[PDB]
Design a protein around this ligand. Structure first.
Ligand SMILES: CCCCCCCCCCCCCC(=O)OC[C@H](COP(=O)(O)OCC[N+](C)(C)C)OC(=O)CCCCCCCCCCCCC
Ligand SMILES: CCCCCCCCCCCCCC(=O)OC[C@H](COP(=O)(O)OCC[N+](C)(C)C)OC(=O)CCCCCCCCCCCCC
Ligand SMILES: *[C@@H]1O[C@H](CO)[C@@H](O)[C@H](O)[C@H]1NC(C)=O
Ligand SMILES: *[C@@H]1O[C@H](CO)[C@@H](O)[C@H](O)[C@H]1NC(C)=O
Length: 1598
């Protein structure tokens, strides 16, 4: 009904906010197309062969060795050794082999395999050995027969003779191409077994062993039987290699396509939680799921455009039968991409509930996307073994469930099916039960399994602002101080016996006890309250955050505990912060919030038009919410608070941090806008709580203390008036105090600061004021008084006294109210600043240990875990055993036919069936049977069927064809093995056996030294592995340098006088010291793994130099790149990426642009000269070229033959390791040492600023100006500030005279004011005095030193308190004071005392050692102004010293700032609150448009620019309908010129004109008329200082 209205109003907002960011939207649609258009290129760059049918092979003979051993070698005859020599049984078996393979072979005999293994490698004639028969029996030394169980080797050459090794390490090819292993070569192929002569020798040895036992039947049997060998015929096949590369490039190119729009979801979701906008909407009625639904319906509808396009350009027939995923039903591709999209949205929602900042979440949730894809590189190959449950459990990571589904799209596409909606359940081959339905299901299950984690972490760990819930929440289904309240007005908030008690003694909040307040309509009520006393528990119960305990409170006739859902209809409210979306207009916020508050669509626009008028923003309409102000945003927030008609209106601190005009505008707004509604303020200013507030309430200990109007409270909780004089040089305070006390008895000389003399005249003696003022009017010149005045108490005193009567804390008991050394210089200074700046940088590595566990632990793992995955070797082995017998594979299945008509087949088939070794028999009925079978079996044929048998006798001759599966390496031997194994049991007793082996010969000395030299795939692979771990380390140096400049902490330090060299050469020293712990922990790793290219010789001190030279060259480059960034976490992720692209990309763009005359690219010589300025490409190409030189040297040294080979082929190793033009690292050392010195120079040339330099004015102002041009002989020598004829002109397209001649002279014991209008130049004068800005035509003498010449000796004598908080969160309350006591001098023996007394002067001792992050927002303003006062400064430049502080702590600070001025200093305040420029000032100066318009103490200003008085009388309730006008007529008769100006329920407020009214006459008149006209109380006061300041408001140029 209306939920559907909110769900669309909340979706228009998201769509608008998101399409206003053009670079992100356009970059989210051009990644998933740039990454999927690559496949179109890669497909049109590859063709498919697709043989028709019928590839079959002929047969070979194994009777005689190939026609290569007929010719003898250069040298002698061939050799054939046997290893058991002493045994005669083996001695005679080899001789029949010799007389069966007659060439000239000489038979040798050896003791044992040790002797042969030493003969082959340690000789020069041991090169013509052909085979070597080895047995497995001790043989009972001299004579013994051969036991019927025989095993033996043959053992061999090592490299192909007739023509790589024998591949005994493996058993199937590692990278199987599609098709036959050797399409040509109809006899075996690569491993040998035919060309070499393995089979001929094996058959001969088998025949020898047969004749050794039969010798007679053998001749008969082999007279009518010969054995040949044939290869399987291979079926017609698809030859396309691209379909094999779709199972490793599709998943990665899908993930890399969605991985950006998967991290702009986390940022968008968390950025709106960080700004507390979701918390604001949740307090208007919107539930917490309306936001997730509106995020989902946007990002899903936005990913469905990319998925459709991706589906389209996968499956468009570019050319006849092309277009990757050619026959694959595009609807199913789309329906799989949509499930991937839902999963990758629901993943980001879950990720965004772990972070508070938007930068961190965006950076570190775009990384977990990748990090959840890793376990697929370890499942892509090992896929045929895994059981179903393990495969299904691996899918709980959505990025892996997608990849195992992108593999099936290749495994189906390489067969002709090409998934078609009707095989969702059918497995792939016949036996691997894992369909394509369990991919979609596991993709849509992880969505829910992630929703269940976000819904729990959003409710139990809400963050900093929300309120948590119990972890099991898914279980339960659930006096005389009070004035008389008005009678005309109707209550709009009624509270009765409200109460709340919190949890166990872990209080941490504030309790209310028995509140009985009451708030009325058409009236502003101000709710004050001391520090711990309720007042935010109360405003939380009323606004609906938690229920009460023992009370009830009605808002608009409802009750907060029963039906809050209807209260929130009229209750509008605006908080402390700002609730506005940047990138929406002024006109859109109102149209959004008016309707969200439940306003009809047809009747909205006129209220938007009216509210744009009430606020006063007709112009500046449809401006973004950025670019407005700081002072029209507080007006738009107030506008939102009361749009659509809202009765109750709870707004707090509405005028915080605003100048004095934008504050009166808001006051006037709120005064015109009540009239109908109840407003509840709460402020920290104690005159805003008085000027606009008609009824006030104060809470002290969770219990309402006093209530009533302002005049009611002031007459009850305050002392008398505040009469103030202005004494002159020839004056005596003693001669005036006698007058005052002798005339009025009770009084108090409150203070005599400056030249004021203020008293306290109690108000229970107002009948003597006639005499006092009449008498003191006369003796003006005789006494020395000029322009006195009087006023009544303030509201700060009332507030401070109420809480003092009913509290006992340490602070509130401190306030008092009226009752009832040579600084260092030269060398010590610089060496002291160096230490101070070194400790600051050092103490960050162990108070934030995320940088130690990421400088020491990331490089180590990144280097070891990826040396493991390479299997770094440094050693070579010698091709181990491989027993040639069926069974190392597994349970096979062996067919055999009997296409015979005669005998010699049946007995053989029965014996074969008696194998019972591996598989059964699987008899068939051959050549064509295999062709048919090898099309429906698929991969099963090449895993369960390796051999065959076919006994086809042509009458007498009985051939036995044995077939071998070429897809294996060692099949042609196993086939003959089984064939002759059974044919030997034929003419023997079947209790025997024959197995053999392969186990090739060991390498010689000259072969190992060449098979070790061809490990060139190690330098290039160990350089990339290290360049990738030095990019997660080089970036951690620009984090303190970014987060210190962003918080403005660097600006204050440079103002206080730190040197541009001590600042940076002290960061560099520590960043080099912190570049050895990893740089020395890498030697341990390279030693443990034994990487010899740089461990063996004195090279451990040559990698260390190469790593120090890289640290030295990249640290200063990472210092320069910090000037781009503002957040410490958007710089890490943008600088590691810069490192990786500057490194890997441009180092890999040179090695593979030099491939052995393939892609030519002779310009690599130019690229490797243009890339010599990047210090990552200079490390990669130095490590690689070190590892290469050492290898090619260690080779061309082992023997002379190698040296000759190197000479012929021009290998050119250098023996210096550091020379030029070589494999030596000379031009890389020399280019990293000269690049780290061209960055320091450029850093200092940026810091030291070599870019920006490559008319009746007033009587008192003129008096001041001409008092410092013609001074007394020594009138100005002991004074701090002597500004003289100071000016500054801009050149921004028009001469702007922002300062005009500014002649002033501040003295010891002063406190200058310097007020001004917005843009009057009060903020360039401040800068120009603190040394920041360029001067023009005039000087200033700060302490004795000119400000145009010696601007370095000045900065050591001035303190400076900024407006913002420029503190270093990793330091301590006391360490930050020690830092600044060192940057200024203060010999090391005094620092203890100078810090100890300051800390307890500001009352910071509890928090002295507390790590300034725990500090409340008001203990930071107490420390920023202890930093200003530490040391002995000549001048102090305070600037809004107490911004966000409550009244008690603010008073306690204004006290110290004045106790520091009593004892001979000079202060310069500059603030926006006119309440603070009176509590600590001695002389003021309003400044408009260029220059001073007035000057003098705040009383001399009120006399000279004041107008008159202001009455505030009230009349009792007796005849209020009759006495009010009777009094109101009298005050228009006896005071000609009054203005009524206000009226509220008992009271008036006049503006009695000051023309001809003494301070005596006005009191006599009212004191006589008090009783004759029935008045309850009254109070006369003079003009207010802020009202005097506002008089000059018309002098603004616009
Ligand atoms: C498993 C399948 C799916 C899993 C996805 C869902 C699980 C997500 C877990 C990952 C996040 C772990 C929790 C986490 O990050 O804590 C938050 C802080 C960031 O703080 P921050 O963002 O300032 O605000 C805190 C948010 N709050 C209030 C809710 C705690 O976290 C940090 O501060 C970031 C940590 C700094 C980097 C760590 C580097 C130190 C050493 C590196 C580790 C060993 C080196 C090899
Ligand atoms: C498209 C792919 C993009 C991703 C590619 C590579 C990006 C690397 C992801 C990790 C980035 C984490 C960023 C980070 O930790 O910030 C450095 C911290 C910030 O501390 P802090 O000053 O509290 O942060 C405030 C700044 N803020 C809010 C904007 C973050 O300052 C520190 O305290 C030092 C911590 C730095 C060490 C972080 C290194 C750990 C990364 C490896 C994590 C592996 C987990 C097993
Ligand atoms: C080859 O070996 C024989 C002994 O077998 C030895 O006499 C001869 O010096 C060797 N030749 C060379 C070149 O070392
Ligand atoms: C092998 O023959 C020897 C002949 O000297 C004899 O010790 C025994 O019969 C056999 N030895 C072993 C250890 O079986």
């Amino acid at each position: 009904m209306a939920v559907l209205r909110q769900l669309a109003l909340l979706l228009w907002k998201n769509y608008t906010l998101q399409k206003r960011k053009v670079l992100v939207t356009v970059l989210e649609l051009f990644l998933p197309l740039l990454f999927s258009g690559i496949l179109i290129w890669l497909r049109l760059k590859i063709q498919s062969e697709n043989v028709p049918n019928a590839t079959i092979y002929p047969g070979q003979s194994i009777q005689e060795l190939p026609l290569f051993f007929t010719f003898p070698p250069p040298g002698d005859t061939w050799e054939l050794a046997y290893i058991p020599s002493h045994s005669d049984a083996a001695k005679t078996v080899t001789e029949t082999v010799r007389r069966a393979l007659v060439i000239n072979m000489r038979v040798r005999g050896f003791p044992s395999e040790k002797d042969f293994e030493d003969y082959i490698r340690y000789d020069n004639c041991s090169s013509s050995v052909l085979a070597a028969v080895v047995f497995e029996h001790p043989f009972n030394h001299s004579k013994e027969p051969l036991p019927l169980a025989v095993k033996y080797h043959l053992r061999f050459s090592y490299t192909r003779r007739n023509y790589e090794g024998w591949h005994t390490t493996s058993l199937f090819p590692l990278f199987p191409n599609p098709g036959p292993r050797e399409p040509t070569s109809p006899d075996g192929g690569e491993p040998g077994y035919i060309r070499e002569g393995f089979l001929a020798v094996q058959h001969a040895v088998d025949r020898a062993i047969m004749e050794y036992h039969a010798d007679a039947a053998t001749r008969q049997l082999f007279q009518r039987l010969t054995v040949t060998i044939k290869r399987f015929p291979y079926p017609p096949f698809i030859a396309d290699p691209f379909l094999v590369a779709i199972q490793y490039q599709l998943p990665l190119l899908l993930l890399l396509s969605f991985t950006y729009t998967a991290l702009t979801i986390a940022r968008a979701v968390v950025q709106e939680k960080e700004r507390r906008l979701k918390e604001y909407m949740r307090m208007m009625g919107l539930s917490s799921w309306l936001h997730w639904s509106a995020w989902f319906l946007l990002f899903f509808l936005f990913l469905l455009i990319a998925a459709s396009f991706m589906t389209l350009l996968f499956c468009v027939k570019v050319k006849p039968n092309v277009a990757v995923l050619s026959r694959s039903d595009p609807s199913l591709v789309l329906a799989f991409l949509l499930c991937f999209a839902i999963s990758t949205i629901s993943f980001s929602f879950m990720v965004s509930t772990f972070f508070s900042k938007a930068n961190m979440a965006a950076a570190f949730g775009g990384f977990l996307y990748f990090f959840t894809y890793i376990p697929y590189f370890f499942v892509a190959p090992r896929y045929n073994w895994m059981t179903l449950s393990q495969k299904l459990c691996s899918c709980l990571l959505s990025n892996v469930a997608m990849a195992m589904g992108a593999q099936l799209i290749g495994k189906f596409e390489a067969k002709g099916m090409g998934i078609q909606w009707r095989d969702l359940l059918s497995p792939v081959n016949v036996d691997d039960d894992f369909c394509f339905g369990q991919v979609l299901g596991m993709l849509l299950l992880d969505s829910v399994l992630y929703g269940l984690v976000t819904w729990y972490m959003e409710a139990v760990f809400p963050g900093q602002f929300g309120v948590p819930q119990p972890w099991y929440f898914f279980i339960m289904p659930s006096n005389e101080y009070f004035e008389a309240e008005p009678e005309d007005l109707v209550a709009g908030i009624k509270i009765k016996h409200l109460s709340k008690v919190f949890r166990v003694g872990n209080k941490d909040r504030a309790a209310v006890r028995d509140l009985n307040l009451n708030l009325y309509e058409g009236q502003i009520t101000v709710l004050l309250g001391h520090n711990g006393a309720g007042k935010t528990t109360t405003l939380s119960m009323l606004t609906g955050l938690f229920p009460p305990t023992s009370g009830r409170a009605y808002i608009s006739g409802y009750e907060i505990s029963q039906d809050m859902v209807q209260i929130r209809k009229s209750l509008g409210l605006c908080p402390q912060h700002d609730i506005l979306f940047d990138n929406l207009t002024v006109a859109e916020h109102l149209y959004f919030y008016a309707q969200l508050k439940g306003l009809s669509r047809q009747k909205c626009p006129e209220e938007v038009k009216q509210m744009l008028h009430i606020i006063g923003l007709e112009d500046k309409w449809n401006s973004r919410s950025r670019f407005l102000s700081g002072g029209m945003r507080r007006k738009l927030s107030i506008g939102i608070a009361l749009i659509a008609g809202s009765k109750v209106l709870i707004l707090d601190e509405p005028t915080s941090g605003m100048d004095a005009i934008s504050r009166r505008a808001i006051w006037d707004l709120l005064q015109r806008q009540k009239s109908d509604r109840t407003i509840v303020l709460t402020t920290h200013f104690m005159d805003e709580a008085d000027l606009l507030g008609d009824r006030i309430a104060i809470m002290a200990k969770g219990e309402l203390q006093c209530c009533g109007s302002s005049l009611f409270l002031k007459q009850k909780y305050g002392a008398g008036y505040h009469m103030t004089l202005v004494k002159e040089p020839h004056c005596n305070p003693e001669d005036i105090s006698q007058l005052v006390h002798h005339h009025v008895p009770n009084a108090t000389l409150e203070s005599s600061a400056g030249a004021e003399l203020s008293f306290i005249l109690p108000r229970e003696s107002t009948h003597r004021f006639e005499g006092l003022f009449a008498k003191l009017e006369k003796k003006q010149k005789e006494l020395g008084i000029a322009s006195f005045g009087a006023s009544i108490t303030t509201m700060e005193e009332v507030f401070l006294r109420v809480g003092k009567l009913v509290d006992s804390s340490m602070d509130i008991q401190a306030i008092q109210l009226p009752a009832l050394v040579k600084l260092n210089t030269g060398l010590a200074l610089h060496c002291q600043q160096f230490w101070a700046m070194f400790l600051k940088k050092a103490a960050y590595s162990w108070r934030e240990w995320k940088m130690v566990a990421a400088q020491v632990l990331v490089p180590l793992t990144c280097v070891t875990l990826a040396l493991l995955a390479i299997n770094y070797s440094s050693e070579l082995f010698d091709d181990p055993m491989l027993r040639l017998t069926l069974g190392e594979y597994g349970r096979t299945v062996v067919p055999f036919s009997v296409p015979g008509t005669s005998q010699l087949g049946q007995q053989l088939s029965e014996h074969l069936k008696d194998a019972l070794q591996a598989e059964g028999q699987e008899p068939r009925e051959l050549e064509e049977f295999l062709i048919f079978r090898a099309s429906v079996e698929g991969g099963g044929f090449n895993e369960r069927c390796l051999v065959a048998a076919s006994f086809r006798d042509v009458g007498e001759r009985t051939v036995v064809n044995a077939l071998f599966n070429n897809q294996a390496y060692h099949s042609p031997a196993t086939a003959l093995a089984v064939v002759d194994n059974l044919l030997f049991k034929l003419l023997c007793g079947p209790h025997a056996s024959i197995v053999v082996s392969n186990f090739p010969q060991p390498r010689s000395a000259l072969q190992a030294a060449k098979d070790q030299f061809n490990e060139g795939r190690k330098g290039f692979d160990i350089a990339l592995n290290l360049l990738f771990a030095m990019a997660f380390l080089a970036s951690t140096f620009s984090i303190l340098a970014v987060s210190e400049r962003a918080v403005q902490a660097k600006h204050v330090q440079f103002v206080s006088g730190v040197h541009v060299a001590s600042f940076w050469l002290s960061a560099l020293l520590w960043d080099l010291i912190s570049f050895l712990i990893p740089s020395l922990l890498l030697l341990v790793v390279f030693k443990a793994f034994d990487v010899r290219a740089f461990t063996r010789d004195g090279h451990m001190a040559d990698t260390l130099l190469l790593l120090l030279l890289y640290g030295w060259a990249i640290i200063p480059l990472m210092y320069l790149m910090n000037f781009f960034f503002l957040g410490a976490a958007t710089a890490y992720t943008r600088l590691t990426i810069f490192n990786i692209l500057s490194g890997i990309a441009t180092f890999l763009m040179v090695t593979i642009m030099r491939i052995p005359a393939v892609k030519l690219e002779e310009l690599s010589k130019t690229l490797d000269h243009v890339f010599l300025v990047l210090p990552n490409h200079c490390l990669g190409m130095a490590v690689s070229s070190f590892y290469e030189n050492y290898e090619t040297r260690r080779y061309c040294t082992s023997s002379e033959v190698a040296a000759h080979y190197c000479k012929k082929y021009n290998i050119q190793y250098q023996e210096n390791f550091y020379a030029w033009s070589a494999p030596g690292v000379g031009r890389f050392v020399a280019s990293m040492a000269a690049s780290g010195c061209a960055y320091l120079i450029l850093l200092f040339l940026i810091e030291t600023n070599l870019l920006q330099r490559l008319l009746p004015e007033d009587q008192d102002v003129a008096d001041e100006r001409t008092r410092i041009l013609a001074p007394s002989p020594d009138s100005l020598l002991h004074t701090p500030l002597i500004i003289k004829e100071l000016s500054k002109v801009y050149e921004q397209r028009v001469p702007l005279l922002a300062v005009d001649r500014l002649s002033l002279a501040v003295q010891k014991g002063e406190c200058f004011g310097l007020l001004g209008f917005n843009g009057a130049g009060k903020t360039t004068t401040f800068k120009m005095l603190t040394g920041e800005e360029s001067l023009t035509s005039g000087d200033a003498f700060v302490g004795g030193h000119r400000i145009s010449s010696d601007v370095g000796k000045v900065r050591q004598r001035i303190g400076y308190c900024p407006q913002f908080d420029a503190l270093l969160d990793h330091m301590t309350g006391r360490e930050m004071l020690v830092m600044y006591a060192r940057l200024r001098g203060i010999p090391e023996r005094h620092i203890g005392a100078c810090v100890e007394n300051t800390l307890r002067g500001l009352l910071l001792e509890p928090h002295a050692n507390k790590l300034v992050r725990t500090y409340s927002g008001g203990n930071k303003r107490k420390l920023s102004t202890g930093i200003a006062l530490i040391g002995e400064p000549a001048v102090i430049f305070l600037d809004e010293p107490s911004t966000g502080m409550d009244p008690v702590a603010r008073r306690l600070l204004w006290d110290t700032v004045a106790r520091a001025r009593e004892s001979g200093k000079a202060i310069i305040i500059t603030s926006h609150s006119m309440e603070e420029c009176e509590a600590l000032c001695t002389r003021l100066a309003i400044m408009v448009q260029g220059q001073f318009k007035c000057l003098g103490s705040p009383q001399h200003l009120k006399s000279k620019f004041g107008s008159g008085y202001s009455l505030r009388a009230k009349v009792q309730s007796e005849g209020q309908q009759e006495a009010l006008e009777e009094f109101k007529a009298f005050v228009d008769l006896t005071f000609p010129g009054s203005v009524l100006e206000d009226e509220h329920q008992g009271m008036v407020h006049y503006h009695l004109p000051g023309r001809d009214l003494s301070w005596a006459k006005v009191f006599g008149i009212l004191e006589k008329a008090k009783e004759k006209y029935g008045v309850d109380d009254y109070s006369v006061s003079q003009i207010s200082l802020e009202q005097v300041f506002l008089s000059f408001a018309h002098l603004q140029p616009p």
